[PDB]
Amino acid sequence: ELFSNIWGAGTKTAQMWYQQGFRSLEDIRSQASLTTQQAIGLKHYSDFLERMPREEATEIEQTVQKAAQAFNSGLLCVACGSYRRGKATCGDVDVAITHPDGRSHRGIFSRLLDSLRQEGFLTDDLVSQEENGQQQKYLGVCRLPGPGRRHRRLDIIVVPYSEFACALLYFTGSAHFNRSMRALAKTKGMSLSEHALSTAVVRNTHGCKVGPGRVLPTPTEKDVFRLLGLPYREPAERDW
């Protein structure tokens, strides 16, 4: 069951396709109906089975940073995921982008992606543009210049500065760790997302609601941990 490995396909679709006679990667490319992601996953099947050394992730991060700072030299670009958690290898790269003035993040997302296309860095686009609140998310594939380079999954997320701490936390992960933090937030009547940490409603000692839900200010990751009642954990401690 090698269908599993194709990107955009899990055990979920591995269990159909087979329903059909398909038992081959080739069988799927030629006869099966495919998602835009699945087509790309098939196109780079061999490459997407290989993790990259973290040095390559650094090169990917700097490539995105260089192209973004040409447009505004104050833009903050950070690679998250397993990279930020300090692993020796990474399966993909998520680059979060913001600006400290907090408003110069707009107008970058479109121009940046285009700039990376022209120089041949971005090779395949899963989703060219996703708009989630004030966050803009690119999902695609990249490849560093030169010979012997494999194709690497790359996400780029541009975020407002007021959401940066929560975004960094969310894209740094791990997925387990996020689930754990969301559960902790809930025990305090809060909710945690990639945008913000907020409370549900405000109630007094009589149980009467006296206000709407509150968006808790979180300038840094440490604020999130403080608000959840936890000692701060470095990214390297967040694998589980």
Swiss-Prot record:
Variant or mutagenesis effect after changing F171 to G/R: Strongly reduces polymerase and terminal transferase activities
Annotated compartments: Nucleus; Chromosome
Positions of Mn(2+) binding: D92, D94, D155
Ranges where the record places region Involved in primer binding: 85-94
Chain spans, region DNA-binding: 10-13, 131-170
Binding annotation for dCTP: R51, S82, Y83, R84, R85, G91, D92, V93, D94, N178
Domain of life: Eukaryota
Organs and tissues of expression: Expressed in a number of tissues. Abundant in testis.
Impact reported for Y170A: No effect on polymerase activity. Reduces terminal transferase activities
Stated consequence of mutating D92A: Loss of polymerase activity
Role according to the record: DNA polymerase that functions in several pathways of DNA repair. Involved in base excision repair (BER) responsible for repair of lesions that give rise to abasic (AP) sites in DNA. Also contributes to DNA double-strand break repair by non-homologous end joining and homologous recombination. Has both template-dependent and template-independent (terminal transferase) DNA polymerase activities. Also has a 5'-deoxyribose-5-phosphate lyase (dRP lyase) activity.
Subunit structure and binding partners: Interacts with PCNA. Interacts with PAXX; promoting POLL recruitment to double-strand breaks (DSBs) and stimulation of the end-filling activity of POLL. Interacts with XRCC4; promoting POLL recruitment to double-strand breaks (DSBs) and stimulation of the end-filling activity of POLL. Interacts with NHEJ1/XLF; promoting POLL recruitment to double-strand breaks (DSBs) and stimulation of the end-filling activity of POLL.
Similarity comment text for this entry: Belongs to the DNA polymerase type-X family.
Protein name: DNA polymerase lambda
Gene name per UniProt: POLL
